[PDB]
C-alpha cells in the first residue's frame, strides 16, 4: 500500500482498520486478523465407529 505522508491508519469498507504506518521506520503494515473459525467433527454413527 502507498499512503500519503500524513496518514497514520488505513481503513477498508466497513471501517475495518486494515493497515498502520510504523512511526519508527516508515513502513505501511497490512493487518490480517488472527486466525479463527468454526470447528466441525465428521463422524460415522457411534453405532458404527468412535
Amino acid at each position: 500500500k502507498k499512503f500519503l505522508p500524513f496518514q497514520q491508519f488505513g481503513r477498508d469498507i466497513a471501517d475495518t482498520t486494515d493497515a498502520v504506518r510504523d512511526p519508527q521506520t516508515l513502513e505501511i503494515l497490512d493487518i490480517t486478523p488472527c486466525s479463527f473459525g468454526g470447528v466441525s467433527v465428521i463422524t460415522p454413527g457411534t453405532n458404527t465407529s468412535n
Binding site: 500500500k1 499512503f3 500519503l4 500524513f6 496518514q7 497514520q8 491508519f9 488505513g10 481503513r11 505501511i28
Partner: protein, 208 residues
C-alpha cells in the same frame, strides 16, 4: 466584492488512508457554490473556521493574525514569513492599526494559487497549484500544522494579489478517495436534490 467558490474548500478531516471508496462525513466544510468575499488590509470574523485562497505572481501575502482584538489585550496567534524562514508565535503583541510579551509558543522553521483552511485547538491545512477569478477545479487541502495552544480565536487578519475568504459550515459531505489514498472528488450533500441522492445512495453514479 465577491466570487463563486465552486467545488473548492475541501480537506482530509482525519489522518486516515482510504481507497476507491465513497466515505461520507459530517464536518466544518465550505458550502459548494457559496459567495466568497474577495480582497486585493481589512479585519474579518474567524467564524467556526476559515477557508482562505490567494492567487499570486509577486508573493504579496506573508501571513495572518488571529484572536479577539488583535492589539495588546491578550495572546494573539501570528504567522509571518521573512526571507527563507517562517516565524510563528502567540505573544501579547501591540500590533499596528494597519500592519503589512508572554509567549506560550514560539517557533522558527497570476501564476501561483495558494489555499488554506484554518479551524478549531487549532489546525492548518493547505494546498498549492500553479495557475494561468479563483479557478474552476477540485483538490483537497492536506494538513500542514497542529498548534496545541488552545488560544480563544474569534477574529482574524491578513499580512501583505487577488484573494478570497469563506466560512466553514457543519455540512454532510461524500468524499471519493482514489487507489492512492487521495481525495479526488466530493459531493456537498445539501447542494441540490441530485447531491442529496448521491449521498442517500452513497454513490457518485446514479442510475435511472
Amino acid at each position: 466584492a465577491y466570487t463563486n467558490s465552486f467545488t473548492r474548500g475541501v480537506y482530509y478531516p482525519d489522518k486516515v488512508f482510504r481507497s476507491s471508496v465513497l466515505h461520507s462525513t459530517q464536518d466544518l466544510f465550505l458550502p459548494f457554490f457559496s459567495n466568497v468575499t474577495w480582497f486585493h488590509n481589512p479585519v474579518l470574523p474567524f467564524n467556526d473556521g476559515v477557508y482562505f485562497a490567494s492567487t499570486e505572481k509577486s508573493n504579496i501575502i506573508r501571513g495572518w493574525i488571529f484572536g479577539t482584538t488583535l492589539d495588546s489585550k491578550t495572546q494573539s496567534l501570528l504567522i509571518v514569513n521573512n526571507a527563507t524562514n517562517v516565524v510563528i508565535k502567540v505573544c501579547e503583541f501591540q500590533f499596528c492599526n494597519d500592519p503589512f510579551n508572554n509567549c506560550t509558543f514560539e517557533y522558527v522553521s497570476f501564476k501561483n494559487l495558494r489555499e488554506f483552511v484554518f479551524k478549531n485547538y487549532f489546525k492548518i491545512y493547505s494546498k498549492h497549484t500553479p495557475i494561468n477569478d479563483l479557478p474552476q477545479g477540485f483538490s483537497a487541502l492536506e494538513p500542514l500544522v497542529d498548534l496545541p495552544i488552545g488560544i480563544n480565536i474569534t477574529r482574524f487578519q491578513t499580512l501583505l494579489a487577488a484573494y478570497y475568504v469563506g466560512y466553514l459550515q457543519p455540512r454532510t459531505f461524500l468524499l471519493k478517495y482514489n487507489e492512492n489514498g487521495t481525495i479526488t472528488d466530493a459531493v456537498d450533500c445539501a447542494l441540490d436534490p441530485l447531491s442529496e441522492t448521491k449521498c442517500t445512495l452513497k454513490s457518485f453514479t446514479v442510475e435511472k
